[PDB]
């Protein structure tokens, strides 16, 4: 099964995922003085409100935090997205020292982690019918950066103990996500993909310019978590983050200037 480790990690992927050498496959290095600045992005439209999240669990590559998805609770729009994006769930990046976490850089910058929330087009049905078309996702990236410590991050925080190993799942309801977001919603957008297998090429990646930051003590819990189920040698959960991929015939453009 892949993993990240030296025998199964992003370097082996392509031998099962061969779309790991695709066109437009990420994450990416997001060079500032590049980017093209385009007027007629339009502004993001995020509506979390009404959102419900269920559970979080422990999948062995992460910890997921699940939102309920059956009708427009959540959902994200505007921008360079054509349609409404439903919320199904968010998880975070992050690695072994402060230094590196995050999948996305900026200018070659890495960050303590980094926040991915999915979204998929709703004019798709499910997120099995989304995740077969090149515009079925939209994911916000948000980058963690080391210093005083995010409020509304503590209750996820407090639940890693019971998700500890592979498998666990805990009842996580009545979490608002909007204790994640930065001040601004600047953003760097373009079309990319999932960075864990199978990497398909669905989706659009809207990756905030303003990163939140997080207490060592939040980000070290995260740290705490293994890999490995209950009961099997101990392997902690730590940089999970796959490197940046070749932009190629790509443009990152800018929602600002
Ligand atoms: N068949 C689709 C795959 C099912 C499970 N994986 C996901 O849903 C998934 C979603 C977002 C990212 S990421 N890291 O790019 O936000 C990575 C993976
Ligand atoms: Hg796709
Ligand atoms: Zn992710």
Request: aromatic letters at 10%; glycine letters at 8%.
């Given at each position: 099964?892949?993993?990240?480790?030296?025998?199964?990690?992003?370097?082996?992927?392509?031998?099962?995922?061969?779309?790991?050498?695709?066109?437009?496959?990420?994450?990416?290095?997001?060079?500032?003085?590049?980017?093209?600045?385009?007027?007629?992005?339009?502004?993001?439209?995020?509506?979390?409100?009404?959102?419900?999240?269920?559970?979080?669990?422990?999948?062995?590559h992460a910890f997921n935090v699940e939102f309920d998805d059956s009708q427009d609770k959540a959902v994200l729009k505007?921008?360079?997205?054509?349609?409404?994006?439903?919320?199904?769930?968010?998880?975070?990046?992050?690695?072994?020292?402060?230094?590196?976490?995050?999948?996305?850089?900026?200018?070659?910058?890495?960050?303590?982690?980094?926040?991915?929330?999915?979204?998929?087009?709703?004019?798709?049905?499910?997120?099995?019918?989304?995740?077969?078309?090149?515009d079925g996702l939209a994911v916000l990236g948000i980058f963690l950066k080391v210093g005083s410590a995010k409020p509304?991050?503590?209750?996820?925080?407090?639940?890693?103990?019971?998700?500890?190993?592979?498998?666990?799942?805990?009842?996580?309801?009545?979490?608002?996500?909007?204790?994640?977001?930065?001040?601004?919603?600047?953003?760097?957008?373009?079309?990319?993909?999932?960075?864990?297998?199978?990497?398909?090429?669905?989706?659009?990646?809207?990756?905030?310019?303003?990163?939140?930051?997080?207490?060592?003590?939040?980000?070290?819990?995260?740290?705490?978590?293994?890999?490995?189920?209950?009961?099997?040698?101990?392997?902690?959960?730590?940089?999970?983050?796959?490197?940046?991929?070749?932009?190629?015939?790509?443009?990152?453009?800018?929602?600002?200037?």
């Amino acid at each position: 099964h892949w993993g990240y480790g030296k025998h199964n990690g992003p370097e082996h992927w392509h031998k099962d995922f061969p779309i790991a050498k695709g066109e437009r496959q990420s994450p990416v290095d997001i060079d500032t003085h590049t980017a093209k600045y385009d007027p007629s992005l339009k502004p993001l439209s995020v509506s979390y409100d009404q959102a419900t999240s269920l559970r979080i669990l422990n999948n062995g590559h992460a910890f997921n935090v699940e939102f309920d998805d059956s009708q427009d609770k959540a959902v994200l729009k505007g921008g360079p997205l054509d349609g409404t994006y439903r919320l199904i769930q968010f998880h975070f990046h992050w690695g072994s020292l402060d230094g590196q976490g995050s999948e996305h850089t900026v200018d070659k910058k890495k960050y303590a982690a980094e926040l991915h929330l999915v979204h998929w087009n709703t004019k798709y049905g499910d997120f099995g019918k989304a995740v077969q078309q090149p515009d079925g996702l939209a994911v916000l990236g948000i980058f963690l950066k080391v210093g005083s410590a995010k409020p509304g991050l503590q209750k996820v925080v407090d639940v890693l103990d019971s998700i500890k190993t592979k498998g666990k799942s805990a009842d996580f309801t009545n979490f608002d996500p909007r204790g994640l977001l930065p001040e601004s919603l600047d953003y760097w957008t373009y079309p990319g993909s999932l960075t864990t297998p199978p990497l398909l090429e669905c989706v659009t990646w809207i990756v905030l310019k303003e990163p939140i930051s997080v207490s060592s003590e939040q980000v070290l819990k995260f740290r705490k978590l293994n890999f490995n189920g209950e009961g099997e040698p101990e392997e902690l959960m730590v940089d999970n983050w796959r490197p940046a991929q070749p932009l190629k015939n790509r443009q990152i453009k800018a929602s600002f200037k």
